[PDB]
From TrEMBL, chains A, B, C, D:
PANTHER family: OXIDOREDUCTASE, SHORT-CHAIN DEHYDROGENASES/REDUCTASES FAMILY MEMBER
Gene Ontology terms, MF aspect: nucleotide binding; oxidoreductase activity, acting on the CH-OH group of donors, NAD or NADP as acceptor
The keyword Oxidoreductase belongs to this UniProt entry's keyword annotation: yes
Keywords, alphabetical: Nucleotide-binding, Oxidoreductase
GO BP terms in the entry: fatty acid elongation
Stated name of the protein: Short-chain dehydrogenase/reductase SDR
PROSITE patterns with a match to the protein in the record: ADH_SHORT
SUPFAM superfamilies documented for this protein: NAD(P)-binding Rossmann-fold domains
Domain of life: Bacteria
Annotated family: Belongs to the short-chain dehydrogenases/reductases (SDR) family.
Residues the record lists as binding NAD(+): 19, 21, 40, 65, 162, 191, 193
Amino acid sequence: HMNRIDLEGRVVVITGGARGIGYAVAQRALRSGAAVALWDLDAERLARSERELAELGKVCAVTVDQTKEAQIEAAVGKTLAAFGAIDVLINCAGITGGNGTTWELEPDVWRQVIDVNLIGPYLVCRAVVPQMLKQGYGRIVNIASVAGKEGNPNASHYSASKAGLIGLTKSLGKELATKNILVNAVTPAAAKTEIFDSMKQEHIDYMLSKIPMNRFLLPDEAASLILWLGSEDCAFSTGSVFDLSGGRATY
Amino acid sequence: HMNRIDLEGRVVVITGGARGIGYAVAQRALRSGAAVALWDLDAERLARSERELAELGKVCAVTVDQTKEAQIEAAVGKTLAAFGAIDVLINCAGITGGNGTTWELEPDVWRQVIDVNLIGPYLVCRAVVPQMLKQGYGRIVNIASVAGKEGNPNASHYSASKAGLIGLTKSLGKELATKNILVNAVTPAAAKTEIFDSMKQEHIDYMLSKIPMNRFLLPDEAASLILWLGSEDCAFSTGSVFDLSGGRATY
Amino acid sequence: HMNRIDLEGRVVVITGGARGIGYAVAQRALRSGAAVALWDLDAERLARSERELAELGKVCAVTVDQTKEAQIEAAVGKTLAAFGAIDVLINCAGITGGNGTTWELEPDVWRQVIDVNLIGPYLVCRAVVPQMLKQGYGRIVNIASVAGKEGNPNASHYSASKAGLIGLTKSLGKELATKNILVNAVTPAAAKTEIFDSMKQEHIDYMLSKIPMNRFLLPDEAASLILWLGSEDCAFSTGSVFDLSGGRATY
Amino acid sequence: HMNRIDLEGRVVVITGGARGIGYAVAQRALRSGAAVALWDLDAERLARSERELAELGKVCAVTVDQTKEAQIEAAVGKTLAAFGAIDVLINCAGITGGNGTTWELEPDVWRQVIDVNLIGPYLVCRAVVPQMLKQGYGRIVNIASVAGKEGNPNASHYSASKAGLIGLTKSLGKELATKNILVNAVTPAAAKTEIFDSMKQEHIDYMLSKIPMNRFLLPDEAASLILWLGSEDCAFSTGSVFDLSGGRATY
Ligand SMILES: NC(=O)c1ccc[n+]([C@@H]2O[C@H](COP(=O)([O-])OP(=O)(O)OC[C@H]3O[C@@H](n4cnc5c(N)ncnc54)[C@H](O)[C@@H]3O)[C@@H](O)[C@H]2O)c1
Ligand SMILES: NC(=O)c1ccc[n+]([C@@H]2O[C@H](COP(=O)([O-])OP(=O)(O)OC[C@H]3O[C@@H](n4cnc5c(N)ncnc54)[C@H](O)[C@@H]3O)[C@@H](O)[C@H]2O)c1
């Protein structure tokens, strides 16, 4: 009994599309009638995901490091050559940077998390917004985290980067509010994906204990809301934050 | 290009269903396959709305003052006799109480706004939750306001009541988080309905000036998100607040 | 090493002044040079508290039920007869209403908590604000709770009442923003106003598990911030919420 | 009638101390009995500010780029040689980065704002926290902005950097909550640190239209709250955000 999201005729770019939440978003988008451009850093995994997802619809895989402007420019070009538009942008491709106190983390890792998780979505938005303006239509969905609302201990870099991504979402949504391009963020709690391998077990336990629903988020459940925000039904919500924390968040 | 929300086989109670946002929710729910129990104080208008909406699906109209426990009990009984379940509850039936400073409003009007807008949804939830527990399923959607997030000047009673409704939503969602009944609120900005007749023109202008999208909310747009929250696709969001303010709200 | 708050020549009304946080605020206000009007329900506890506090400065004990307009009017008159002004209003008369799920609490207790915790501060503000407008100066501090930010399970009435009090604070602060009367709320965690039952150590452990500082708030610590908000140095903060949750709150 | 903040015997580091809010904080800290280490980039402005402030108490001027680990290490050493401790850290070195839409700002300016406004305070905290842990005491105050709560249009980099700084504050406060080092942020509105161009009265009117108090924040008013958060009376607030927006912020 899933809702039938209407993405017919639309083109959806998904960063981080090779695995995890991004891959589940790709599956649901293809089942909703979209063409999907799957953007990811991991060229080998991306090839396997492309061939799996092609069974569901039109897919174009693009290898891109979303911290590098020149690679993003080439990715926009390849996407437009395949499909002719970018109607929907899902920024999904973050890293955790491991766990440690603010003063014990390595500064190069702190900077890397800010680069991948905050600078990256900024650079992708900078490249894609002019195309959405050209179209007179777009939807942008930034995948943040409940950590960006809350400031998790032992995850200061991750939390600051996702809090910053929420701030970017609020500014960009207000800049585009009269231009038919709506821009929102989602705040998931932990979902059991491969990103768990980059964290300490005690941090995973901590994240679970704070969830009133008493289980982790499933990627398919995340995709339901993410693609709602990528659809025309999302019509009067912009610069806003939509929660996926299983009852945890208090705002 | 609207999404097809799957409410097939479900029963939706809508308070305030005779007009405005509640009526638009009823239309969309019927088009989504739900049976609708339309609850409202205005017995005459409710009869006209029932006969209009019956063209779209199964409708049972129920006259009820949602400040009166005994009338709510009778309304639950009438709804169950018609349709056998209450799967979804949309609390929509608020009043504004006019406009004036906190110290110049009449205390009886201040109390009346709290009664209708906060006590009322509490009493309806109290009566309906045991039925949802009996079913092993429910969705509750409380229609608050951006005023409940922000505290509008000259609307202290309305703002306090809607802020209180958000607090109730957060408590109730956490109480039910392991019971398969998810509970969320929405925060609309102003929509041009008959509720405008109860406010001063300068307050209407104030509300509009704060909207980055530069227009009012349409009832049909509100219904898209309200019924998403009333669907099974809403799966890992509870005790949460979903915005409909056209870019205004900053949280 | 406590700060010396300058309340010299100011008159402070404290509701709930005979007990708990209100009593600690009274002690600190007298030590800061204020005259204090202690407003409370229990004439006997008031008389005892007045005798103790008179050793610190000028105190007027006022018996008043802050849910009753006529008693508030008599209380304002008695305060003005004693001291000639009301410069600062501290609303600290809240009750908890016990604990239970939203659908199992008694409706009359739900209503009583709304009346005491939300209607009461509204009624006191509506009587006191006109006096502050005559003076051209005032400070209002509403004691809310972290429950008003978060929606605690099994405390839906308490949480809704405190969330509503925060909404009132936001509206009233904006109404008075050019009138030299600043209006703010505080959100304490679990405050150690009472030694709990010797059999509830498990529940005490649970409450402390939500507080990163791993102890309860002391009333004297609350009074430091409450009276800062009651002082002239609070100069550019209004309609705002100041946290006292020991690291718990995430906004 | 200002409060007498007790900073007797304490050492306060102020980044951005030569100008604006940082200079006003220095004046108030010296008047409160503190020794002040003024940290700033401009040796010339630092020397002028040091000469003026030395009339109020003990001051050590430290030339440091707070984006450079090696310079921060030299700055901590010079501060400890002069004064023997760092009890209080005020991070007040932010830049605006100009204005423009998200897609038209220069990426190197976007990165520079993140570096100065988010990476810099992180680097200063990582050097100073170990010293506060050796002392068994500290207070950290991060000067953020209302833009970090709200996401101002045409200031996406500034807003994201300040939102990220708030996230860092929340994580670091919780990491230190049992270590006697409390960590909080302030959110000023438009502060009158500089007289704006004589031709921008229309833009000044627009900024003031968003502030209910209808004037700009004064640096000395900001310093009252900033140093309260730097004092022992700030005792049960950590990982929190204290507002200085003149009624604008809605959380
Ligand atoms: N998984 C969770 O529990 C969880 C919780 C909260 C938020 N989130 C967020 O959701 C998003 C998806 O998480 P996930 O669990 O699917 O993660 P994941 O590790 O399974 O997948 C992330 C993907 O991003 C790609 N990627 C990383 N850096 C990149 C870069 N510079 N350029 C391009 N691609 C890059 C990786 O190759 C990978 O395929 C992330 O932004 C994450 O922060 C996840
Ligand atoms: N319309 C807006 O601009 C706007 C903005 C923000 C929030 N909201 C909220 O959305 C909801 C719907 O607003 P609307 O514009 O459709 O209002 P409306 O005035 O058009 O309809 C409200 C309905 O509620 C009914 N009602 C009132 N008191 C009742 C009671 N005690 N018991 C039962 N029914 C009762 C009325 O008869 C009416 O049919 C309200 O809760 C309102 O506060 C509306």
